[PDB]
Amino acid sequence: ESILEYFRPYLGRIEIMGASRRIERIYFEISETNRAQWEMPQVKESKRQFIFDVVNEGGEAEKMELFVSFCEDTIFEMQIAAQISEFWGELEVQRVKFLNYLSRNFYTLRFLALFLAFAINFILLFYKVSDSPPNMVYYFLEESTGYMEPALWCLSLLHTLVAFLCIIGYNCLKVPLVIFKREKELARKLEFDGLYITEQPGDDDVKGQWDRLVLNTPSFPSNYWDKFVKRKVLDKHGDIFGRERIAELLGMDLASLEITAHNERKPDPPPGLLTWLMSIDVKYQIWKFGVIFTDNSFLYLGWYMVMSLLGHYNNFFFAAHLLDIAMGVKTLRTILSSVTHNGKQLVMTVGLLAVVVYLYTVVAFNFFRKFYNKSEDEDEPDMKCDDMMTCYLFHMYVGVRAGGGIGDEIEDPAGDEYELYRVVFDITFFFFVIVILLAIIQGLIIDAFGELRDQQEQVKEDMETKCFICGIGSDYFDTTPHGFETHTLEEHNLANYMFFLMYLINKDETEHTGQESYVWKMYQERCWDFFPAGDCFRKQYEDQLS
Amino acid sequence: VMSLLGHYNNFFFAAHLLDIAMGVKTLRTILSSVTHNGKQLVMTVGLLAVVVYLYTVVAFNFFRKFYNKSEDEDEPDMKCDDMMTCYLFHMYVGVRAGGGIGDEIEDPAGDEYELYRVVFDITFFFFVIVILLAIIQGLIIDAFGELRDQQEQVKEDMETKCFICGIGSDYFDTTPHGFETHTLEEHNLANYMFFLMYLINKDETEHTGQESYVWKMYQERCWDFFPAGDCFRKQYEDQLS
Ligand SMILES: Nc1ncnc2c1ncn2[C@@H]1O[C@H](COP(=O)(O)OP(=O)(O)OP(=O)(O)O)[C@@H](O)[C@H]1O
Ligand SMILES: Nc1ncnc2c1ncn2[C@@H]1O[C@H](COP(=O)(O)OP(=O)(O)OP(=O)(O)O)[C@@H](O)[C@H]1O
Ligand SMILES: Cn1c(=O)c2c(ncn2C)n(C)c1=O
Ligand SMILES: [Ca+2]
Ligand SMILES: [Ca+2]
Ligand SMILES: [Zn+2]
Ligand SMILES: [Zn+2]
C-alpha cells in the first residue's frame, strides 16, 4: 500500500471504448510538472470560462471536439508558460528579458496605470479658473502645497510610460495565442474543408478573405504545430485540382522538397541585421497586423495609450481613463453586460419614442398651435411652434424631461373650445410617452438580469448533473455510495483525458503499446470514438461484479 | 450603551426603536432581501458618482457660463467657477431634481451652444435618472425573487425522494402510503437520534453485538450504518418482507 500512496498523484487511469465492444482501462504516468502547471490559476480560470461557454452553448454534438480543441490550446499555453518561465547580443538579451518581465507583470502594470489615473484625477480636482491673471479666464492650480504642478507633470509622464509598457506586455503575451488559434483553424479548414481548393471562401468572411495572404507565404506554418499541413493538402488534392495549381497556391517547391527528402543540406545563416530585416516576411507581418487590429482588447489598449497622450497634451483628457474601472472590476463588467444584453431593443425603443414624439408634434402643429407662447412679457411674444423643426425640438427637449408630459408647458386651454381637445392631447401624451416607454426600458434591463441569472443557474446544474463524458443519470451510480462522485472524479476525469493525450504526445512512437498506439493514431485522424459515451466498467462488468 | 446614552440625553432613546427590525420577523426577512445585494448597491452608487463626476468635468469647460442662480443682477452667483463646488452643486441638485440638471442650468436658446446643452441635458437625464435607478429597482426585485425561489426549492427538496435514501418516491408510492411510511418509520431522523442517545445512555456491558458495532463504528466517525438508498422492502422484495 505504501508505494501506491507515494505514487498516487503520478498514477493516471483512462478508459477507452476499444477495438472490440468492451471498455478497456489504460494506466499511465502523469507528469507532476504538467499537473502543477495545470493547477496554476490562470489555466483554472481559462477552463472555468471554457466549461461555462460550452454549457451555455450546449455543443452536445461536438462537445468532445471542443474539449480536444481546448486541450490543444492549453498545451500551446503550456509551451508559452515554459517560454515565460524564469553589443547586439547584449541588447537582444536585455530586450527579451524585458519582454519576459512585461509578460509576467502585465496585470500589475494595468493596475498601476489605473492607480496613477486616479492619482492624476485627484490632482486635477484642485484646479481653479480665474478671469484675472493669477484678461480671458486662466485655468491654474489653486493650492498651498508646493511643486504640485511638477508632480502632476511627472505623474503624467509616468502614466504614459506605464501605458506603453502595457502595450508591449499585451503584444507579448496575448498575440501568439490568437495567432496559433487562427493558424490551427485555417489549417483544419484548408485540409478537410478545402476552402481554397476546388472552393472559394465567402465574401462576408472578412477573416476568410484576409487569410488568403498567408496561403503562399513560407511563414504560414510558423507558431503552429503542423509544419506540413500544406504537404498533406497537396498529397490529398493534387490529382484532382491540379498539382501545379496546388503548388503555386500553397507555395511549396517540388524540387526542393524532394531533394530534401533524399538528403538535405545545412547552410550557414548570415547573422547580419540588414539581411535579417530583409529576411523578415513582410506579407506575414501584414497579415498579423491585420488580424491583431481586429481584436477588441488590443484596440482598447491602443485607445488607452492615445488617451494618455491626449491627457499629456490637455490635462482634462485624463478624466476619460477613469472608465477603465468598468473592465478592471468584474461586477461592473457583469452589470454592463446585463445592460448591453438588450442593446438592440433600447435603440429601437428610443426610436419609437422619437417617432411618437414626431407624431404628437405633427398633430400639434396644426391644432393647439396658438397655445405655444412662453414669453411672460406681452411686448415681445415668443411662439415656440411657428414651424415643425423648432416645435419638435421644443417638445423633445421639454416634454420628455418634464414630469407629467408637455401639457404643463402648453398654455391652459380653459375658456376655449379646444379645452377638451388639448386636455385629451395632454392625457394621451403623458400616458403613451412618459409611462409605457420607460416601462419597456425598465423591463428590458430587469429581464436581461434575470436571463443572465438563470443562465448561471442552469450552467451550475448542468455542470453538476449526469456526469460529463457519459451524460447518464446520477441515480445509477448513486446506488453505490459516492458512486456518481467517484465516476466523475476517476473513471472519466477530464484532466485524466488531457494527461493521457499529453503522455501519448510526449512518449516516443517505438515505446507505444497496441492500445495507446491505436488511441494515438485514431486521435490523429480527428475521430473521437475512444470517448466511452454512456458506458463504464460498472455497466460493462456488472455481471462480473467489476 | 445606547440605553446609557439615552439616560444621559433623552434624545438618544429614539435609536432603540430600530430594535423592531430584529424583534419582528417580516422586517428581518425584508432587510435580508435588501442586504442580499449590498455589494451591488454600493458599487452602483459608485458608478453614479463616477458618471456625475464625468458630467461635471465635461460641463466645467463648456456651458460654464450657464451657471448663475442669482435673480438679482447686482450680485451674480457663479455655481461652476471651480469643479469641487460645481460637482457639489450637480450631485446635490441634479440627482434630487426630477428631470436632471437641465432645468437648473440656464436655457441655452439664442446661443450657439443651444443644441450642445440640449444634448447634454438629454444624455444626463437618460443615463443618470433612469438607468441607475432601474438597476436599483431590479436588484431588490431579483433578491426578493431569489429568496422566494430558495424557499420553494427548500420545500420541494424537503418533500422529495426521502432523506436517508434519496430514492424516488414512486417506488414506495406503488404501495399505498408507501413513501410516507418509509420516511416516517423506516428512516426517521428522530429515530436515528433516539437510537444514538440510547447507545450513549446504556452501559457498555449491556450492548449486544449489533449495537456495540454501531456504537464503536460511530465513535470512529464513520457513517456507513446509514442505509443509503436501501430499505427492507428492496432487500426482501422477493421475500415479500
Ligand atoms: N467526467 C467528469 N470529470 C470531471 N468532473 C466532472 C465530470 N462530470 C462532471 N464533472 C463535474 O465537474 C466538476 C469539476 O470540479 P470542481 O468544479 O468542483 O472543481 P474546482 O475546485 O472548481 O476546480 P479548479 O480549482 O481547478 O477550478 C466536478 O465537481 C463535477 O461536478
Ligand atoms: N427519512 C425521513 N425521516 C423523516 N422525515 C423525512 C424523511 N425524509 C423526508 N422527510 C420529510 O421530513 C418531514 C418532517 O415532518 P414535518 O416537517 O411535516 O413535521 P412538522 O410538523 O413540521 O414538525 P415539528 O413540529 O417538529 O417542526 C416529513 O413530513 C417528510 O416530508
Ligand atoms: C506536439 N503537438 C502535437 O503532437 C500535436 C498538437 N496538436 C495535435 N498534435 C498531435 N500540438 C498542438 C502539439 O504541440
Ligand atoms: Ca514497439
Ligand atoms: Ca455483554
Ligand atoms: Zn463519466
Ligand atoms: Zn428513507
Side-chain angles (χ1 to χ4, degrees), chain A residues 121 124-127 129 137 139 316 319 322-323 325 331-332 335 353 393 396-397 400-401 441-442 453, chain B residues 40 43 47 53-54 57 60-61 64 81 83 99 102-103 114-115 117-118 121-122 130 134-135 142 146:
Chain A
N121 292 128
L124 291 176
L125 281 176
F126 295 86
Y127 268 92
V129 61
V137 298
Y139 294 78
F316 302 134
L322 291 174
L323 291 182
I325 70 173
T331 306
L332 266 183
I335 294 175
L353 168 63
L393 177 55
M396 61 79 71
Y397 173 66
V400 163
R401 288 170 48 253
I441 302 288
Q442 292 283 328
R453 172 178 66 82
Chain B
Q40 299 291 321
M43 61 79 71
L47 186 48
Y53 173 74
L54 314 184
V57 167
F60 170 74
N61 293 319
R64 175 174 51 186
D81 279 335
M83 73 291 291
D103 50 351
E114 156 66 0
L115 304 180
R117 204 189 71 82
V118 161
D121 309 337
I122 298 304
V130 171
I135 303 174
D142 189 28
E146 181 66 26

Side-chain angles (χ1 to χ4, degrees), chain A residues 422-440:
Chain A
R422 204 189 71 82
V423 161
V424 175
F425 176 96
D426 309 337
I427 299 304
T428 47
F429 190 92
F430 161 74
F431 275 128
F432 284 73
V433 169
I434 304 296
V435 171
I436 300 298
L437 300 181
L438 302 193
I440 303 174

Side-chain angles (χ1 to χ4, degrees), chain B residues 1-158 160-237 239-241:
Chain B
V1 165
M2 185 64 72
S3 300
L4 310 175
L5 287 173
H7 189 273
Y8 155 68
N9 172 20
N10 296 4
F11 302 134
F12 276 95
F13 277 120
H16 298 278
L17 291 174
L18 290 182
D19 198 16
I20 70 173
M22 172 295 307
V24 190
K25 175 178 300 179
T26 306
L27 266 183
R28 214 177 320 141
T29 64
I30 294 175
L31 292 193
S32 77
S33 296
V34 173
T35 57
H36 198 34
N37 289 336
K39 203 173 61 182
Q40 299 291 321
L41 291 163
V42 299
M43 61 79 71
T44 310
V45 302
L47 186 48
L48 168 63
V50 174
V51 301
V52 165
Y53 173 74
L54 314 184
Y55 275 96
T56 63
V57 167
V58 300
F60 170 74
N61 293 319
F62 293 98
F63 321 130
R64 175 174 51 186
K65 167 194 55 177
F66 305 110
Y67 285 106
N68 187 6
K69 303 295 294 183
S70 175
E71 179 182 2
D72 304 359
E73 303 186 0
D74 60 344
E75 304 167 0
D77 193 356
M78 298 324 92
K79 297 300 191 179
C80 200
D81 279 335
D82 61 79
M83 73 291 291
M84 61 79 71
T85 184
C86 191
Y87 178 66
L88 177 55
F89 169 78
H90 281 93
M91 61 79 71
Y92 172 66
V93 190
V95 163
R96 288 170 48 253
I101 189 73
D103 50 351
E104 320 298 338
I105 315 182
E106 307 171 19
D107 171 39
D111 306 340
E112 77 297 333
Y113 291 165
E114 156 66 0
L115 304 180
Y116 294 64
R117 204 189 71 82
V118 161
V119 175
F120 176 96
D121 309 337
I122 298 304
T123 47
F124 190 92
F125 162 74
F126 275 128
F127 284 73
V128 169
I129 304 296
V130 171
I131 300 297
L132 300 181
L133 302 193
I135 303 174
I136 302 288
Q137 292 283 328
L139 288 168
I140 314 292
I141 299 179
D142 189 28
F144 272 101
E146 181 66 26
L147 307 181
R148 171 178 66 82
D149 276 285
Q150 296 167 198
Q151 305 273 348
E152 173 56 43
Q153 283 73 242
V154 167
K155 167 188 179 59
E156 56 84 14
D157 288 330
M158 183 278 288
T160 189
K161 65 176 179 182
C162 189
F163 176 82
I164 295 297
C165 294
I167 298 301
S169 64
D170 53 352
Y171 161 83
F172 316 98
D173 302 349
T174 295
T175 297
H177 311 72
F179 173 78
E180 167 56 24
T181 298
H182 179 76
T183 64
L184 182 56
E185 287 79 6
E186 307 178 13
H187 300 142
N188 180 21
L189 280 82
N191 287 350
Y192 285 87
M193 183 278 288
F194 279 130
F195 183 77
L196 177 54
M197 161 295 298
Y198 203 51
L199 297 190
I200 309 181
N201 184 16
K202 58 178 307 168
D203 292 332
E204 296 180 359
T205 175
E206 317 294 344
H207 283 99
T208 185
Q210 299 295 322
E211 65 182 0
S212 304
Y213 179 78
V214 175
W215 156 245
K216 60 174 176 51
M217 192 295 268
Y218 152 78
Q219 291 172 298
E220 307 300 339
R221 303 304 95 178
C222 179
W223 312 130
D224 289 358
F225 59 97
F226 277 112
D230 198 351
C231 63
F232 289 97
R233 309 172 53 174
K234 306 173 184 299
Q235 188 65 31
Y236 288 74
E237 63 185 2
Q239 281 283 15
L240 310 179
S241 298

Side-chain angles (χ1 to χ4, degrees), chain A residues 16 96 151 442 449 468:
Chain A
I16 67 172
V96 301
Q442 292 283 328
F449 272 101
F468 176 82

Side-chain angles (χ1 to χ4, degrees), chain A residues 68 71-73 75-76 79 180 184 188 224-227 501 504-506 520 523-524 526:
Chain A
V68 169
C71 294
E72 297 173 352
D73 302 353
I75 293 174
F76 178 78
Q79 298 179 0
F180 161 79
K184 181 164 61 171
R188 305 295 199 273
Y224 175 58
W225 173 64
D226 192 16
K227 297 159 293 300
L501 177 54
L504 297 190
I505 309 181
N506 184 16
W520 156 245
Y523 152 78
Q524 291 172 297
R526 303 304 95 178

Side-chain angles (χ1 to χ4, degrees), chain A residues 39 44 47-48 463 467-469 488 492-494:
Chain A
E39 299 285 71
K44 276 174 178 305
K47 67 94 173 176
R48 290 183 176 98
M463 183 278 288
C467 189
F468 176 82
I469 295 297
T488 64
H492 300 142
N493 180 21
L494 280 82

